[PDB]
Amino acid sequence: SGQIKVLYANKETNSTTNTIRPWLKVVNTGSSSIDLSRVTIRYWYTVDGDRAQSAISDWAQIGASNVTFKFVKLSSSVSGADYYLEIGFKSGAGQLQPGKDTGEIQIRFNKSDWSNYNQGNDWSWLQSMTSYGENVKVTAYIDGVLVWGQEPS
Ligand SMILES: [Ca+2]
């Protein structure tokens, strides 16, 4: 079936920033292996003045090229989100075995005019978790089914 945890490291402590930096990791905590292509992660936030947006992995243990990004503007705003960044994995990311993790996934994202975000009104931001921990407001899915975290209400 599939059991996972997502770990999170905030690499931008300034609330005001042109670059959100939610580093991530997927841990397979169940008993079967999981194809990482089946896994999606969502970082829910408020855009703070809508613009084109770009997300980049500068480096990932599984190979940055294997990380996919999709910005989704939410149909309706919810508490601390009008967008999410959906992080996914190509076949090249491969399989996560029981008890193992992806290792580090670096992520940054910015608006195309480098205008500032405010991270303080972001559902998924955890300012102080600057090393890898459990940020339950970054949610994760297997085949589109929520398996980790709390989506914004
Ligand atoms: Ca915001």
Side-chain angles (χ1 to χ4, degrees):
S1 184
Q3 189 180 67
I4 56 170
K5 185 159 62 171
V6 171
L7 304 179
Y8 161 96
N10 171 50
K11 303 301 200 181
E12 185 48 83
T13 48
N14 293 358
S15 190
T16 288
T17 187
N18 69 17
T19 301
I20 300 180
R21 291 194 192 256
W23 293 17
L24 291 178
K25 205 131 99 164
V26 187
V27 180
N28 175 349
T29 60
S31 62
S32 52
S33 59
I34 314 186
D35 280 351
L36 280 169
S37 48
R38 294 169 64 197
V39 179
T40 46
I41 307 154
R42 281 177 208 172
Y43 189 85
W44 305 77
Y45 67 101
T46 47
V47 72
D48 311 324
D50 204 0
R51 304 276 189 287
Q53 290 176 92
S54 171
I56 305 285
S57 194
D58 299 313
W59 191 90
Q61 178 61 71
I62 64 163
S65 56
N66 292 312
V67 176
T68 63
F69 297 114
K70 171 175 170 238
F71 293 102
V72 183
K73 188 177 177 304
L74 294 169
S75 283
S76 326
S77 286
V78 286
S79 186
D82 58 28
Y83 262 93
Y84 62 84
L85 174 58
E86 178 169 288
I87 301 101
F89 307 90
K90 307 188 167 170
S91 47
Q95 203 178 72
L96 205 63
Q97 311 302 346
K100 297 215 282 148
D101 69 60
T102 54
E104 159 175 291
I105 307 159
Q106 297 178 3
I107 295 160
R108 62 185 169 88
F109 72 90
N110 54 276
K111 294 176 275 193
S112 61
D113 67 354
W114 297 96
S115 58
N116 283 330
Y117 290 107
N118 171 17
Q119 299 197 86
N121 60 5
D122 289 349
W123 178 259
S124 302
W125 196 48
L126 248 182
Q127 177 175 46
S128 68
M129 180 170 283
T130 57
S131 298
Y132 286 103
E134 308 201 3
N135 181 343
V136 302
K137 299 192 170 171
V138 179
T139 57
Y141 309 74
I142 291 165
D143 302 329
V145 184
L146 181 76
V147 298
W148 161 268
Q150 182 194 0
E151 298 179 312
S153 46

Coordinates of all heavy atoms in Angstrom, one line a residue, residues 71-133:
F71 N 3.4 24.5 -10.0 CA 2.7 25.5 -9.2 C 1.2 25.4 -9.5 O 0.8 25.4 -10.6 CB 3.2 26.9 -9.5 CG 4.5 27.2 -9.0 CD1 5.6 27.2 -9.9 CD2 4.8 27.4 -7.7 CE1 6.9 27.5 -9.5 CE2 6.1 27.7 -7.2 CZ 7.1 27.7 -8.1
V72 N 0.4 25.3 -8.4 CA -1.1 25.2 -8.5 C -1.7 26.3 -7.8 O -1.4 26.4 -6.5 CB -1.6 23.8 -8.0 CG1 -3.1 23.7 -8.3 CG2 -0.9 22.7 -8.7
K73 N -2.3 27.3 -8.5 CA -3.1 28.4 -7.9 C -4.4 27.8 -7.5 O -5.1 27.1 -8.2 CB -3.3 29.5 -8.9 CG -3.9 30.7 -8.4 CD -4.1 31.8 -9.4 CE -4.7 33.0 -8.9 NZ -6.1 32.7 -8.3
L74 N -4.7 27.9 -6.2 CA -5.9 27.2 -5.7 C -7.2 28.0 -6.2 O -7.2 29.2 -6.2 CB -5.9 27.2 -4.1 CG -4.8 26.3 -3.5 CD1 -4.7 26.6 -2.0 CD2 -5.1 24.9 -3.8
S75 N -8.2 27.2 -6.6 CA -9.5 27.7 -6.9 C -10.1 28.7 -5.9 O -10.5 29.8 -6.3 CB -10.5 26.6 -7.3 OG -10.1 26.2 -8.5
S76 N -10.1 28.3 -4.6 CA -10.4 29.2 -3.5 C -9.2 29.2 -2.5 O -8.6 28.2 -2.3 CB -11.6 28.7 -2.7 OG -12.6 28.1 -3.5
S77 N -8.9 30.4 -1.9 CA -8.0 30.6 -0.8 C -8.5 29.8 0.4 O -9.7 29.5 0.6 CB -8.0 32.1 -0.4 OG -7.3 32.9 -1.3
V78 N -7.5 29.4 1.1 CA -7.8 28.7 2.4 C -6.8 29.2 3.4 O -6.0 30.1 3.1 CB -7.7 27.1 2.2 CG1 -8.9 26.6 1.4 CG2 -6.4 26.7 1.5
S79 N -6.9 28.8 4.7 CA -6.1 29.4 5.7 C -4.6 29.2 5.5 O -4.0 28.1 5.6 CB -6.5 28.8 7.1 OG -5.8 29.5 8.1
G80 N -3.9 30.3 5.1 CA -2.5 30.3 4.8 C -2.1 29.8 3.4 O -0.9 29.5 3.1
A81 N -3.1 29.6 2.5 CA -2.7 29.3 1.2 C -3.7 29.7 0.1 O -4.9 29.6 0.2 CB -2.5 27.8 1.1
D82 N -3.1 30.3 -1.0 CA -3.7 30.5 -2.3 C -3.0 29.7 -3.4 O -3.4 29.8 -4.5 CB -3.9 32.0 -2.6 CG -2.6 32.8 -2.6 OD1 -1.5 32.2 -2.9 OD2 -2.6 34.0 -2.4
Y83 N -1.9 29.1 -3.0 CA -1.1 28.3 -3.9 C -0.5 27.0 -3.2 O -0.4 27.0 -2.0 CB 0.1 29.1 -4.4 CG 0.0 29.7 -5.7 CD1 -0.5 31.0 -5.8 CD2 0.4 29.1 -6.9 CE1 -0.5 31.7 -7.0 CE2 0.3 29.7 -8.1 CZ -0.2 31.0 -8.2 OH -0.2 31.7 -9.3
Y84 N -0.1 26.1 -4.0 CA 0.8 25.1 -3.6 C 1.9 24.8 -4.6 O 1.6 25.0 -5.8 CB 0.2 23.8 -3.0 CG -0.6 23.0 -3.9 CD1 0.0 22.0 -4.8 CD2 -2.0 23.0 -3.9 CE1 -0.8 21.2 -5.6 CE2 -2.8 22.2 -4.7 CZ -2.2 21.3 -5.5 OH -3.0 20.6 -6.3
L85 N 3.1 24.5 -4.1 CA 4.1 24.0 -5.0 C 4.0 22.5 -4.9 O 4.1 21.9 -3.8 CB 5.5 24.5 -4.6 CG 6.6 23.9 -5.4 CD1 6.4 24.1 -6.9 CD2 7.9 24.5 -4.9
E86 N 3.7 21.8 -6.0 CA 3.7 20.3 -5.9 C 5.0 19.8 -6.4 O 5.5 20.0 -7.5 CB 2.5 19.7 -6.6 CG 2.5 18.2 -6.6 CD 1.2 17.6 -7.1 OE1 0.2 17.7 -6.4 OE2 1.2 17.0 -8.2
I87 N 5.6 19.0 -5.5 CA 6.9 18.4 -5.8 C 6.6 16.9 -6.1 O 5.9 16.3 -5.4 CB 7.9 18.5 -4.6 CG1 8.1 20.0 -4.3 CG2 9.2 17.8 -5.0 CD1 7.3 20.5 -3.1
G88 N 7.2 16.5 -7.2 CA 7.0 15.1 -7.7 C 8.3 14.5 -8.2 O 9.3 15.3 -8.1
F89 N 8.3 13.3 -8.6 CA 9.5 12.6 -9.0 C 9.4 11.8 -10.3 O 8.3 11.3 -10.5 CB 10.0 11.6 -7.9 CG 10.1 12.3 -6.5 CD1 9.0 12.3 -5.7 CD2 11.3 12.8 -6.1 CE1 9.1 12.9 -4.5 CE2 11.4 13.4 -4.9 CZ 10.2 13.5 -4.0
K90 N 10.4 11.9 -11.1 CA 10.4 11.2 -12.4 C 10.7 9.7 -12.1 O 11.1 9.4 -11.0 CB 11.5 11.7 -13.4 CG 11.5 13.2 -13.6 CD 12.5 13.7 -14.6 CE 12.2 15.1 -15.0 NZ 13.3 15.6 -15.9
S91 N 10.5 8.9 -13.1 CA 10.9 7.5 -12.9 C 12.4 7.4 -12.5 O 12.7 6.5 -11.6 CB 10.6 6.6 -14.2 OG 11.1 7.3 -15.4
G92 N 13.2 8.3 -12.9 CA 14.6 8.2 -12.5 C 14.9 8.4 -11.1 O 16.0 8.0 -10.6
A93 N 14.0 9.0 -10.3 CA 14.1 9.0 -8.9 C 14.1 7.5 -8.3 O 14.8 7.2 -7.3 CB 13.0 9.8 -8.3
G94 N 13.3 6.6 -8.9 CA 13.4 5.2 -8.6 C 12.6 4.9 -7.4 O 11.6 5.5 -7.2
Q95 N 13.0 3.9 -6.6 CA 12.2 3.3 -5.6 C 12.8 3.6 -4.3 O 14.0 3.5 -4.0 CB 12.3 1.8 -5.9 CG 11.1 0.9 -5.4 CD 11.2 -0.6 -5.7 OE1 12.1 -1.3 -5.2 NE2 10.4 -1.0 -6.7
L96 N 11.9 3.9 -3.3 CA 12.3 4.0 -1.9 C 12.0 2.7 -1.2 O 10.8 2.3 -1.1 CB 11.6 5.2 -1.3 CG 12.2 5.9 -0.2 CD1 13.6 6.5 -0.6 CD2 11.3 7.0 0.4
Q97 N 13.0 2.1 -0.6 CA 12.9 0.9 0.1 C 12.4 1.2 1.5 O 12.6 2.3 2.0 CB 14.2 0.1 0.2 CG 14.9 -0.1 -1.2 CD 14.1 -0.8 -2.2 OE1 13.1 -1.3 -1.9 NE2 14.5 -0.8 -3.5
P98 N 11.7 0.2 2.2 CA 11.3 0.4 3.6 C 12.5 0.8 4.5 O 13.6 0.3 4.3 CB 10.9 -1.1 4.0 CG 10.4 -1.6 2.7 CD 11.3 -1.1 1.7
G99 N 12.2 1.7 5.4 CA 13.2 2.3 6.3 C 14.2 3.3 5.7 O 15.1 3.8 6.4
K100 N 14.1 3.5 4.4 CA 15.1 4.4 3.8 C 14.4 5.7 3.3 O 13.2 5.9 3.3 CB 15.7 3.6 2.6 CG 16.5 2.4 3.1 CD 17.7 2.1 2.3 CE 17.4 1.4 1.0 NZ 18.4 1.7 -0.1
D101 N 15.3 6.7 3.0 CA 14.8 8.0 2.6 C 15.5 8.5 1.3 O 16.6 8.0 0.9 CB 14.9 9.0 3.7 CG 16.4 9.3 4.1 OD1 17.1 9.8 3.2 OD2 16.7 9.2 5.2
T102 N 15.0 9.6 0.7 CA 15.5 10.1 -0.5 C 16.8 10.8 -0.3 O 17.4 11.2 -1.3 CB 14.5 11.1 -1.1 OG1 14.2 12.1 -0.2 CG2 13.2 10.5 -1.5
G103 N 17.2 11.0 0.9 CA 18.2 12.0 1.1 C 17.6 13.4 0.8 O 16.5 13.6 0.5
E104 N 18.5 14.4 0.9 CA 18.1 15.8 0.8 C 17.6 16.2 -0.6 O 18.1 15.7 -1.6 CB 19.3 16.7 1.2 CG 19.3 18.1 0.7 CD 20.4 18.8 1.3 OE1 20.4 19.0 2.6 OE2 21.4 19.1 0.6
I105 N 16.6 17.0 -0.6 CA 16.0 17.6 -1.8 C 16.1 19.1 -1.6 O 15.3 19.6 -0.7 CB 14.7 17.1 -2.2 CG1 14.6 15.6 -2.2 CG2 14.2 17.7 -3.5 CD1 13.2 15.1 -2.1
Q106 N 16.9 19.8 -2.3 CA 17.0 21.2 -2.1 C 15.9 21.8 -3.0 O 15.7 21.4 -4.1 CB 18.3 21.8 -2.5 CG 19.5 21.3 -1.6 CD 20.8 21.9 -2.0 OE1 20.9 22.7 -2.9 NE2 21.9 21.4 -1.3
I107 N 15.3 22.8 -2.5 CA 14.2 23.5 -3.3 C 14.4 25.0 -3.0 O 14.6 25.4 -1.8 CB 12.8 23.0 -2.9 CG1 12.7 21.5 -3.3 CG2 11.8 23.8 -3.7 CD1 11.5 20.9 -2.5
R108 N 14.3 25.8 -4.1 CA 14.0 27.2 -3.9 C 13.0 27.6 -4.9 O 12.9 27.0 -6.1 CB 15.2 28.0 -4.0 CG 15.9 27.9 -5.4 CD 17.2 28.7 -5.4 NE 18.0 28.4 -6.5 CZ 18.0 29.0 -7.7 NH1 17.1 30.0 -8.0 NH2 18.8 28.6 -8.6
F109 N 12.2 28.6 -4.6 CA 11.3 29.2 -5.5 C 11.1 30.7 -5.4 O 11.2 31.2 -4.2 CB 10.1 28.4 -5.6 CG 9.1 28.5 -4.5 CD1 8.1 29.5 -4.5 CD2 9.1 27.5 -3.5 CE1 7.2 29.6 -3.5 CE2 8.2 27.6 -2.5 CZ 7.2 28.6 -2.5
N110 N 10.9 31.4 -6.5 CA 10.8 32.8 -6.5 C 9.8 33.3 -7.5 O 9.3 32.5 -8.3 CB 12.2 33.4 -6.8 CG 12.7 32.9 -8.1 OD1 13.3 31.8 -8.2 ND2 12.4 33.6 -9.2
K111 N 9.4 34.5 -7.3 CA 8.5 35.2 -8.4 C 9.4 35.7 -9.5 O 10.6 35.9 -9.3 CB 7.6 36.2 -7.8 CG 6.6 35.6 -6.8 CD 5.7 36.6 -6.1 CE 6.3 37.2 -4.8 NZ 5.2 37.9 -4.0
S112 N 8.9 35.7 -10.7 CA 9.7 36.0 -11.8 C 10.3 37.4 -11.9 O 11.3 37.7 -12.5 CB 8.9 35.8 -13.1 OG 7.8 36.7 -13.1
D113 N 9.6 38.4 -11.2 CA 10.2 39.7 -11.0 C 11.0 39.9 -9.6 O 11.2 41.0 -9.2 CB 9.0 40.7 -11.0 CG 8.0 40.6 -9.9 OD1 8.2 39.7 -9.0 OD2 7.1 41.4 -9.8
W114 N 11.3 38.8 -9.0 CA 12.0 38.7 -7.7 C 11.3 39.5 -6.6 O 11.9 39.9 -5.6 CB 13.5 39.1 -7.9 CG 14.2 38.1 -8.7 CD1 14.4 38.2 -10.1 CD2 14.7 36.8 -8.3 NE1 15.1 37.1 -10.5 CE2 15.2 36.2 -9.5 CE3 14.8 36.1 -7.1 CZ2 15.9 35.0 -9.4 CZ3 15.4 34.9 -7.1 CH2 15.9 34.3 -8.2
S115 N 10.0 39.8 -6.8 CA 9.3 40.5 -5.7 C 9.2 39.6 -4.5 O 9.3 38.4 -4.6 CB 7.9 40.9 -6.2 OG 7.1 39.8 -6.6
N116 N 9.1 40.3 -3.3 CA 9.2 39.6 -2.1 C 7.9 38.8 -1.8 O 6.8 39.1 -2.2 CB 9.3 40.6 -0.9 CG 10.8 41.1 -0.8 OD1 11.7 40.4 -1.2 ND2 10.9 42.4 -0.4
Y117 N 8.2 37.7 -1.1 CA 7.1 37.0 -0.4 C 7.1 37.4 1.0 O 8.1 38.0 1.5 CB 7.5 35.5 -0.5 CG 7.4 34.8 -1.8 CD1 8.6 34.4 -2.4 CD2 6.2 34.4 -2.4 CE1 8.6 33.7 -3.6 CE2 6.2 33.7 -3.5 CZ 7.4 33.3 -4.1 OH 7.4 32.6 -5.3
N118 N 6.1 37.0 1.7 CA 5.9 37.1 3.1 C 5.6 35.6 3.5 O 4.6 35.1 3.3 CB 4.7 38.0 3.5 CG 4.4 37.8 5.0 OD1 5.2 37.4 5.8 ND2 3.2 38.3 5.4
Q119 N 6.6 35.0 4.3 CA 6.4 33.6 4.6 C 5.6 33.4 5.8 O 5.0 32.3 6.0 CB 7.8 33.0 4.8 CG 8.6 33.1 3.5 CD 9.8 32.2 3.6 OE1 9.7 31.0 3.3 NE2 10.9 32.7 4.2
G120 N 5.4 34.4 6.6 CA 4.7 34.5 7.8 C 3.2 34.1 7.7 O 2.6 33.6 8.6
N121 N 2.6 34.3 6.5 CA 1.2 34.0 6.3 C 1.1 32.8 5.3 O 0.2 32.6 4.5 CB 0.5 35.2 5.7 CG 1.1 35.7 4.4 OD1 2.0 35.0 3.9 ND2 0.6 36.8 3.8
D122 N 2.1 31.9 5.4 CA 2.2 30.6 4.6 C 1.9 29.4 5.5 O 2.6 29.1 6.5 CB 3.6 30.4 4.0 CG 3.8 31.4 2.9 OD1 2.8 32.0 2.5 OD2 5.0 31.4 2.5
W123 N 0.8 28.7 5.1 CA 0.5 27.4 5.8 C 1.7 26.5 6.1 O 1.9 26.1 7.2 CB -0.6 26.6 5.0 CG -1.0 25.3 5.6 CD1 -0.6 24.1 5.2 CD2 -1.9 25.1 6.7 NE1 -1.2 23.1 6.0 CE2 -2.0 23.8 6.9 CE3 -2.6 26.0 7.5 CZ2 -2.8 23.2 7.9 CZ3 -3.4 25.4 8.5 CH2 -3.5 24.0 8.7
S124 N 2.5 26.3 5.1 CA 3.5 25.3 5.2 C 4.8 25.8 5.8 O 5.7 25.0 6.1 CB 3.8 24.6 3.9 OG 2.7 24.0 3.4
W125 N 5.0 27.1 6.0 CA 6.2 27.6 6.6 C 6.5 27.2 8.1 O 5.6 27.3 8.9 CB 6.4 29.1 6.4 CG 7.7 29.6 6.5 CD1 8.9 29.2 6.0 CD2 8.1 30.8 7.3 NE1 9.9 29.9 6.3 CE2 9.5 31.0 7.1 CE3 7.4 31.7 8.0 CZ2 10.2 32.0 7.7 CZ3 8.2 32.8 8.6 CH2 9.6 32.9 8.4
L126 N 7.6 26.7 8.4 CA 8.0 26.5 9.8 C 9.3 27.2 9.9 O 10.4 26.6 9.7 CB 8.0 25.0 10.1 CG 7.0 24.6 11.1 CD1 7.2 23.1 11.4 CD2 7.0 25.4 12.4
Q127 N 9.3 28.4 10.3 CA 10.5 29.3 10.3 C 11.7 28.6 11.1 O 12.8 28.6 10.6 CB 10.2 30.6 11.0 CG 11.4 31.5 11.2 CD 11.0 32.8 11.8 OE1 10.2 32.9 12.8 NE2 11.5 33.9 11.2
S128 N 11.4 28.0 12.2 CA 12.4 27.6 13.1 C 12.9 26.1 12.9 O 13.9 25.8 13.4 CB 11.9 27.7 14.6 OG 10.9 26.7 14.8
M129 N 12.2 25.4 12.0 CA 12.7 24.0 11.7 C 13.7 24.2 10.6 O 13.4 23.9 9.5 CB 11.5 23.1 11.3 CG 11.9 21.7 11.0 SD 10.4 20.7 10.8 CE 10.0 20.5 12.6
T130 N 14.9 24.6 10.9 CA 16.0 24.8 10.0 C 16.8 23.6 9.6 O 17.6 23.6 8.7 CB 16.9 26.0 10.4 OG1 17.5 25.8 11.6 CG2 16.1 27.3 10.4
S131 N 16.7 22.6 10.5 CA 17.2 21.3 10.2 C 16.1 20.3 9.9 O 15.0 20.6 10.3 CB 18.0 20.8 11.4 OG 19.1 21.7 11.6
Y132 N 16.4 19.2 9.3 CA 15.3 18.3 9.0 C 14.4 17.8 10.1 O 14.9 17.2 11.1 CB 15.8 17.1 8.2 CG 16.2 17.5 6.8 CD1 17.5 17.6 6.4 CD2 15.2 17.7 5.8 CE1 17.8 18.0 5.2 CE2 15.6 18.1 4.5 CZ 16.9 18.3 4.2 OH 17.3 18.6 3.0
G133 N 13.1 18.1 10.1 CA 12.1 17.6 11.0 C 10.7 17.4 10.4 O 10.5 17.5 9.2

